[PDB]
């Protein structure tokens, strides 16, 4: 399928143990997509002071359209030293590996895959 319904655990930035997906734009997008498929991807909501506590390159989920079955349609955009790779809508959050951190909420998304 071109889209997959996912429910992403929303993590507090100070709980996150693995603060990024890797070392290049291509690697972080690759790893983000693998973790999304494997159910091992969390979401951190972006506010003042969050991104400097995480590792670049960043992988964002961004709203791709204006929401089937409660699931917002999203796509991935990476960022490294202020340059984004991809073009999309509003940020829903930054993706990180999930390694068993307790979430505060779930974010239902339809991921363009």
UniProtKB/Swiss-Prot annotation:
Subcellular location: Host cytoplasm
Domain CoV Nsp1 globular: 2-113
Source organism, top-level taxon: Viruses
Region (Disordered): 1-113
Described purpose of this protein according to its UniProt entry: Inhibits host translation by associating with the open head conformation of the 40S subunit. The C-terminus binds to and obstructs ribosomal mRNA entry tunnel. Thereby inhibits antiviral response triggered by innate immunity or interferons. The nsp1-40S ribosome complex further induces an endonucleolytic cleavage near the 5'UTR of host mRNAs, targeting them for degradation. This inhibits the integrated stress response (ISR) in the infected cell by preventing EIF2S1/eIF2-alpha phosphorylation upstream of stress granule formation and depletes host G3BP1.
Protein's UniProt name: Host translation inhibitor nsp1
Species annotation: Severe acute respiratory syndrome coronavirus 2 (2019-nCoV)
Shown residues within the full chain: 11 to 125 of 7096
